[PDB]
Design an enzyme around this catalytic site. Structure first.
Site, short mmCIF file in Angstrom:
data_model
loop_
_atom_site.label_atom_id
_atom_site.label_comp_id
_atom_site.label_asym_id
_atom_site.label_seq_id
_atom_site.Cartn_x
_atom_site.Cartn_y
_atom_site.Cartn_z
N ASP A 258 0.75 -1.20 -0.06
CA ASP A 258 -0.05 0.03 0.05
C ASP A 258 0.87 1.25 0.05
OD1 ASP A 258 -1.72 2.11 0.19
OD2 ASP A 258 -2.79 1.32 2.09
N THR A 259 0.91 1.92 -1.31
CA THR A 259 1.84 3.14 -1.32
C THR A 259 1.39 4.07 -0.93
OG1 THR A 259 1.24 3.37 -3.54
CG2 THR A 259 3.32 2.10 -3.43
N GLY A 260 -0.04 4.25 -0.64
CA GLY A 260 -0.52 5.20 0.11
C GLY A 260 -0.54 5.33 1.73
#
Ligand code: JZQ
Lengths: 99, 99
Positions: B25-27
């Protein structure tokens, strides 16, 4: 481009004639943008995040430009803390995770 | 590996000698996992997303394997809707976004 993950992966997007800063977010199924106007028909939707659910307006077939790549997809508009480009648009620009 | 985003970027992790499913999850700044037992002392942390904030327990210097790649770092434990691997550990496994 190759974007490292030392800080937030923020990019400048063009949407509905407006420039916005948004986060490239692999954990997001869909793209959600803070309150703004978009053309056409919309349907209400509930989306769930780390804190629970928010109510959004679902707009379909919306053109977005992101790092020179034009893509078309569904855009959700609502009270998101951060503008988030989700997988539905990440695929279209050919965005992948690599390690 | 190269991971496309047509489906959720779900991977197998190993933490506390057990296998679990987690979203890359890059967020997410941090890594958050569902209720489980971890060793050592913990300190309080609030984390914010769509929908609002949740209280979590912060454990430091935790051994964790993500898609076979060995990391040692901060793992948050609490009422997250899904197990999330965030940027703190994505950077440890040398993960980038590419398009
Ligand atoms: C940029 C944000 C702030 S908003 C969206 N976001 C993220 O990290 C997002 O990828 C999340 C991930 C997620 C999916 C499902 C349950 C719970 C969470 N996604 C979402 O918020 C919503 O995604 C959708 C959706 F839009 C439609 C259908 C299904 C979905 F899962 C960031 C965030 O919350 N990050 C926080 C976070 C998360 C985990 C650990 C630490 C922290 C600190 C913050 O960085």
């Amino acid at each position: 481009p190759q974007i490292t993950l030392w800080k937030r992966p923020l990019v400048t997007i063009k949407i509905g004639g407006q420039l916005k800063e948004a986060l490239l977010d692999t954990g997001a199924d869909d793209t959600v943008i803070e309150e703004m106007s978009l053309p056409g028909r919309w349907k209400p939707k509930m989306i769930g995040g780390i804190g629970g659910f928010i109510k959004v307006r679902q707009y379909d077939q919306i053109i977005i430009e992101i790092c020179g790549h034009k893509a078309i997809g569904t855009v959700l508009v609502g009270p998101t803390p951060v503008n988030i480009i989700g997988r539905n648009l990440l695929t279209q620009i050919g965005c992948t995770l690599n390690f």
